[PDB]
Design an enzyme around this catalytic site. Structure first.
Site, mmCIF file in Angstrom:
data_model
loop_
_atom_site.group_PDB
_atom_site.id
_atom_site.type_symbol
_atom_site.label_atom_id
_atom_site.label_comp_id
_atom_site.label_asym_id
_atom_site.label_seq_id
_atom_site.Cartn_x
_atom_site.Cartn_y
_atom_site.Cartn_z
ATOM 1 N N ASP A 1 -54.358 28.553 -8.075
ATOM 2 C CA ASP A 1 -55.113 28.522 -9.336
ATOM 3 C C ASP A 1 -55.692 29.872 -9.712
ATOM 4 O OD1 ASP A 1 -58.273 26.832 -8.359
ATOM 5 O OD2 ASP A 1 -57.275 28.675 -7.645
ATOM 6 N N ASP B 1 -59.544 25.444 -0.841
ATOM 7 C CA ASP B 1 -60.876 25.878 -1.299
ATOM 8 C C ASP B 1 -61.898 25.559 -0.224
ATOM 9 O OD1 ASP B 1 -62.896 26.990 -3.201
ATOM 10 O OD2 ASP B 1 -63.448 24.967 -3.347
ATOM 11 N N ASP C 1 -55.682 29.577 -1.896
ATOM 12 C CA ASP C 1 -56.999 29.790 -2.503
ATOM 13 C C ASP C 1 -57.708 30.877 -1.660
ATOM 14 O OD1 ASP C 1 -59.321 27.306 -3.994
ATOM 15 O OD2 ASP C 1 -58.888 29.368 -4.547
ATOM 16 N N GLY C 2 -58.579 31.574 -2.337
ATOM 17 C CA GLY C 2 -59.425 32.587 -1.687
ATOM 18 C C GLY C 2 -60.669 32.606 -2.550
ATOM 19 N N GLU D 1 -58.042 35.956 -3.201
ATOM 20 C CA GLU D 1 -56.995 35.202 -3.819
ATOM 21 C C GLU D 1 -55.618 35.801 -3.535
ATOM 22 O OE1 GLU D 1 -58.077 35.068 -8.247
ATOM 23 O OE2 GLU D 1 -60.041 34.626 -7.464
ATOM 24 N N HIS E 1 -58.822 20.884 -9.355
ATOM 25 C CA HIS E 1 -58.472 20.234 -8.106
ATOM 26 C C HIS E 1 -57.980 18.810 -8.313
ATOM 27 C CE1 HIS E 1 -60.929 23.228 -5.750
ATOM 28 N NE2 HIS E 1 -59.678 23.578 -6.001
#
Length: 156
Positions: free
Chosen positions: A70, A135, A10-11, A48, A125
């Site tokens: 995601d 996250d 995640d980013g 991301e 999530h």
């Protein structure tokens, strides 16, 4: 008893463009390593991508990888074959400008030829705690930026 290496990424950003961070989890032999960093000013898309890059650049033995993320961006690129398209055309668009985020996409391409990767696209999530974690990690780093994202172009 062993298949891959599992990678979770995640980013995210607080205002895009704004300070951003990434969070990644790597699960080696019964061990799990986390990575995280925040950048003074960058974009969502770049955060991301960078998350995936840093995790994969961390491997020093050819692996069988399963990467769960995601990000819509990575997904788009991978599913729509950006990399394949670009590499044939020297990484420039039809109007001969360098593709957007070429610095990151190249680093990614370079990692992909190393490992056998299996992408897993997640949505929500809910029932994805390692992603929830990235996250939390990502938003936390973004709050205490220590790096400058040099390839971050203001302009276009």
């Amino acid at each position: 008893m062993l298949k891959q290496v599992e990678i979770f990424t995640d980013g995210s950003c607080l205002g895009n463009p704004g300070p951003g961070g990434y969070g990644a989890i790597l699960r080696y032999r019964g061990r799990e390593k986390t990575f995280s960093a925040g950048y003074t000013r960058t974009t969502n898309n770049r955060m991301e991508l960078m998350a995936a890059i840093v995790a994969l650049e961390a491997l020093k033995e050819h692996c069988e990888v399963i990467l769960s993320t995601d990000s819509q961006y990575v997904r788009q690129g991978i599913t729509q074959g950006w990399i394949h398209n670009w590499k044939k055309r020297g990484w420039k668009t039809a109007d001969k400008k360098p593709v957007k985020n070429v610095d990151l996409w190249q680093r990614l391409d370079a990692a992909l030829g190393q490992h056998q990767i299996k992408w897993e696209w997640v949505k929500g999530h809910a029932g994805h705690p390692e992603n929830e974690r990235c996250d939390e990690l990502a938003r936390a780093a973004a709050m205490n930026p220590t790096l400058e994202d040099t390839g971050y172009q203001v302009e276009v």
